[PDB]
Amino acid sequence: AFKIGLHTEFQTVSFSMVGLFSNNPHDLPLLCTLNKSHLYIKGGNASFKISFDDIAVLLPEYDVIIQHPADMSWCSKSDDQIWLSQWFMNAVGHDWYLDPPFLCRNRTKTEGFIFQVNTSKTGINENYAKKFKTGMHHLYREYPDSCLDGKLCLMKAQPTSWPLQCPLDHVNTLHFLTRGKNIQLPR
Amino acid sequence: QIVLTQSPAIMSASPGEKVTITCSASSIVSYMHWFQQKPGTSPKLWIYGTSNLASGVPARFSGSGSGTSYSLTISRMEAEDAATYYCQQRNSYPPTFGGGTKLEIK
Amino acid sequence: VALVESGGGLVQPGGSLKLSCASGASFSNAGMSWVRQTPDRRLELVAAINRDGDITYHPDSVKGRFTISRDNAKNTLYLQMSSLKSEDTAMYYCAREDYYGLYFYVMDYWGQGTSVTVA
Ligand SMILES: *[C@@H]1O[C@H](CO)[C@@H](O[C@@H]2O[C@H](CO)[C@@H](O[C@@H]3O[C@H](CO)[C@@H](O)[C@H](O)[C@@H]3O)[C@H](O)[C@H]2NC(C)=O)[C@H](O)[C@H]1NC(C)=O
Ligand SMILES: *[C@@H]1O[C@H](CO)[C@@H](O)[C@H](O)[C@H]1NC(C)=O
Ligand SMILES: *[C@@H]1O[C@H](CO)[C@@H](O)[C@H](O)[C@H]1NC(C)=O
């Protein structure tokens, strides 16, 4: 803010963010990216953390190969996690009847909750890899885009405590609402 | 029901050498862990993720793997390296261990 | 972190046992397990208890005979197992279990263990 010309001044106005988010009648799912790698998505009560690397922790032979949201009930004991996972996959674009399925764990297994999707840019699943890349770009402002075109690349989502330093941005929330169709926000 | 076969059962190396331990599976396994045990004691975790060293292992131990076959490697071993090693996989329940390999110093 | 065990010994082939196993770590944020080592050096997992005692698992070789329950208030574990058999004579270890690596859930701090004999 300084004098420009002879009687005119140049000054700026910045809009608050915490008030708008805490003031909405419903609860909004918010996306965040901390440091330069750690992606985060917080729904109602699911504070999911997303990372990318070429580590295969799940295998098709011994797992649950989720193809439909009905089978998702066999993974977690809490409905909020199921809602968050299903709607995130719907928002990125995963129409469940024409696409490869994705792998999760049986709930009775004593190894927590986790879901992972392979998006390696190889011959097979190349189209799925590009579609997921576009979805990630649209759903995250400055996408780091790890696991460049090479041997392997698998994304993993796990439940962690929500960190109290994420910049509560709202562009990503708007894109999540726009891409996600028929998303029902509670409260 | 994944089964694990270790090779070889008995080792007798030289006071400072490079040794390898082979661990094959029945079916494909993604990740594998290595545990170490001394006679008259309890096993202690040594390698996790087939590539991650344990908290407090000298920088001469290493691991590798592919599909069904995994390997453990010691670059330059000393007398303290004379003990029993166990494979472990936790991909399909029940989690299964190896048959155990004993390594001794000549 | 330290762990102690008690309740082992010699029992007739057909009795029932209650084995007791923690200090140092809050242990309310860790999931634990019990494993067997036969007189020949062979290992096998027999009990696995989730951080919350809501989920508890045992394999076929102990299904219907081995149960494990943790008293969080005392930071202890009681494993009750009936129908003693000769093949179930071995060393028993109680071991912690935590995440080492963003995705790896592996056993930690295997305890001293106690001896169970059938004769
Ligand atoms: C996610 O997708 C990737 C895409 O690469 C999967 O890796 C691929 O796994 C297939 C399994 O059939 C490999 O095909 C075989 O590979 C070799 C030659 O590369 C050979 O054995 C056969 O001729 C056959 O082509 C494929 O190569 C492999 N891709 C790479 C780059 O190695 C990956 O497994 C998927 N992840 C999950 C969790 O399902
Ligand atoms: C993430 O950022 C926080 C806050 O600055 C920092 O303390 C932490 O070390 C960072 N972690 C990584 C892995 O960069
Ligand atoms: C584990 O969950 C899967 C997923 O549906 C199911 O098929 C399987 O029967 C479950 N395991 C047990 C032991 O019930």
Can you describe what's shown?
Chain A is an alpha+beta fold and 187 residues long. Chain A is built from four helices and nine strands; from the N terminus they run ββαββββαββαβα. In chain A, strands 3-4-5-9-8-7-6 form a seven-stranded antiparallel sheet. A two-stranded antiparallel ribbon of chain A has the order 1-2. The termini of chain A are far apart. Chain B is mostly beta strands and 106 residues long. Chain B is built from no helices and eleven strands. Chain B is globular, with a radius of gyration of 13 Å. Chain C has 119 residues and is mainly β. Chain C has strands at residues 9-11, 16-20, 32-38, 42-49, 56-57, 66-71, 76-82, 90-99, 105-110, 114-118. In chain C, β8 (90-99) and β9 (105-110) form a beta hairpin. The termini of chain C are far apart. Chains in contact: A-B, A-C, B-C. At the B-C interface, β5 of B face β4 and β9 of C. Residues 34-35 of chain A line the site of one 2-acetamido-2-deoxy-beta-D-glucopyranose (NAG). The PDB classes it as viral protein. Keywords: Viral protein, Glycoprotein, GPC, junv, Junin mammarenavirus, GP1, GP2, signal peptide, virus membrane, antibody. JUNV GP1, GP2, SSP complex with neutralizing antibody in a pseudotyped virus membrane. Chain A is Pre-glycoprotein polyprotein GP complex.
Q: Which strand order spans the largest sheet of chain A, edge to edge or round the barrel?
A: 3-4-5-9-8-7-6
Which chain pair shows the most residues in contact? B-C, 18 and 20 residues
What does the oligomeric state look like here?
part of a larger assembly
Q: Calculate the terminal CA-CA distance of chain C, rounded to whole Å.
A: 34 Å
Q: What structural class do the secondary elements of chain C suggest?
A: mainly beta
Taken from the alpha-carbon principal axes, the silhouette of chain A is globular
**Outline of chain C, from the CA principal axes?**
globular
| Helical run tally of chain A | 4
Largest sheet of chain A: 7 strands, antiparallel
How large is the radius of gyration of chain A?
A: 19 Å
Percent range of helical residues of chain C: under 10%
What can be said about the biggest beta sheet of chain C?
Answer: 7 strands, mixed
- β-strand number of chain C: 10
Q: Quote the beta fraction of chain A.
A: 15-25%
Strand residue percentage of chain C: over 45%
Helix-and-strand structural type of chain A: alpha+beta
The ordered H/E elements of chain A are EEHEEEEHEEHEH
Order of helices and strands of chain C: EEEEEEEEEE
Rg from alpha-carbon coordinates of chain C? 14 Å
Count the strands of chain A? 9
PDB class: viral protein
Keywords: Viral protein, Glycoprotein, GPC, junv, Junin mammarenavirus, GP1, GP2, signal peptide, virus membrane, antibody
Entry title: JUNV GP1, GP2, SSP complex with neutralizing antibody in a pseudotyped virus membrane
Chain A: Pre-glycoprotein polyprotein GP complex
